[PDB]
Amino acid sequence: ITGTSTVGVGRGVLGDQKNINTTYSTYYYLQDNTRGNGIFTYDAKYRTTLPGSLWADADNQFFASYDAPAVDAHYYAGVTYDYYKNVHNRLSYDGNNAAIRSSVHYSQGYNNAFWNGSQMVYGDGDGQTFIPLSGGIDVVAHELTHAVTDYTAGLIYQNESGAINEAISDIFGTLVEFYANKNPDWEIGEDVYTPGISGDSLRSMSDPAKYGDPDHYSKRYTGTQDNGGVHINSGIINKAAYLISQGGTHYGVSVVGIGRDKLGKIFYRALTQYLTPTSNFSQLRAAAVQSATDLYGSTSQEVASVKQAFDAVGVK
């Protein structure tokens, strides 16, 4: 909507107070005009018709419980945007400052969020397995990273190419969580997952096995469930990334860490220069290996670490 760019205030899912860029025209709409062509947040009103209604607020103050999911979705979408702009020199998910649209209050007790090819969609959770999922910055960045992939590598969402796609969203969802630096870890969804269980998460990049996911190519799931286990075998590529950045010894193979920032530059370049829709794990290794060579040279520690990490997880 047309209006004047102003700044509101509100509290998020986790009870933290934060400012949000809004637009005034009778009401105060969740419309962030300070970022690309806009970050718009909508209200699905507990239904599944998308996007819904561009969030309208009468006083620019968003402290009601019903406003919280919209606050985090509106706020954390801008954080992810900033991450891709400041770090990777990418303007929104399509590189041309595409508008970022998110719908909250999706359906009733919906325990999931997703990118539907055009927007992000957050459920409020059933209060037991999940609380509103926009509360997790890694969740928000995870889903917006799916948009970045759709516009770049375009990895099919099935089998190895899908696991890579999921792994990319887990990686850059974690790196955004660090980029914001508010209780950052190598776990996925800890901030919105099971409020009545202290210390657990949905997935674990550090130890995928913690929750039953493979951390080595031998233990990969080969059935049909989960589009071939895209949320399962992502652990193999999650672990590899966790080793590239943090380093360690995994099944006896030792990996020297190079840090998060370099992991990011490597995987982004792979995602935007060398990966294709049908890429597989072995092709992902090659993509990361070339990226690290372009960035730091063939005889560099970075290249060695990549080879060491994909070796540790059994990817040749």
- Known catalytic residues? 143, 231
Orientation of helix 137-151 relative to helix 159-180, angle to 10°: 130
Give me the half-sphere count of Cα atoms (radius 13 Å) on the Cβ side of residue 260: 15
- From the list ligand XYP, ligand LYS, Zn ion, none, pick the one residue 108 interacts with, judged by a Cβ distance below 5 to 8 Å according to partner type: ligand XYP
User: Within positions 200 to 239, which residues make up the interface with Ca ion, using CB under 5 A?
Assistant: 200
| b/e map 278-303, b = 16+ CB within 10 Å | ebbbebbbbbbbbbbbeebeeeeebb
What, of ligand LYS, Zn ion, ligand XYP, none, does residue 169 touch, CB below 5 to 8 Å by kind? Zn ion
User: Is 161 a residue that touches Zn ion (CB under 5 A)?
Assistant: no
Only segment of 207-215, 218-226, 277-285, 291-299 that touches ligand XYP (CB under 6 A): 207-215
Place of tokens 């891709």: 84
Instruction: Find the helix packing angle between 159-180 and 68-86, rounded to 10°.
Output: 100
Which 215-234 residues touch ligand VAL, going by CB under 6 A? 231
169 is a site residue for Zn ion (CB under 5 A): yes
- Asked if 164 interacts with ligand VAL (CB under 6 A), we say no
Residue 114 touching ligand XYP (CB under 6 A) = no
Residues 127-166 touching Ca ion, rule: CB under 5 A, are 138
Q: Is 193 annotated as a binding residue?
A: yes
**Between 44 and 202, whose beta carbon lies closer to ligand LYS?**
202
Whose CA is closest to 149, among 129, 169, 120, 128?
169
How far is the C-alpha of 53 from the C-alpha of 45, rounded, in Å?
8
Contacting residues toward Ca ion, per CB under 5 A: 57, 59, 61, 138, 177, 183, 185, 187, 194, 197, 200
Binding residues for ligand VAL, rule: CB under 6 A, are 112-114, 139, 142, 188-189, 202, 231
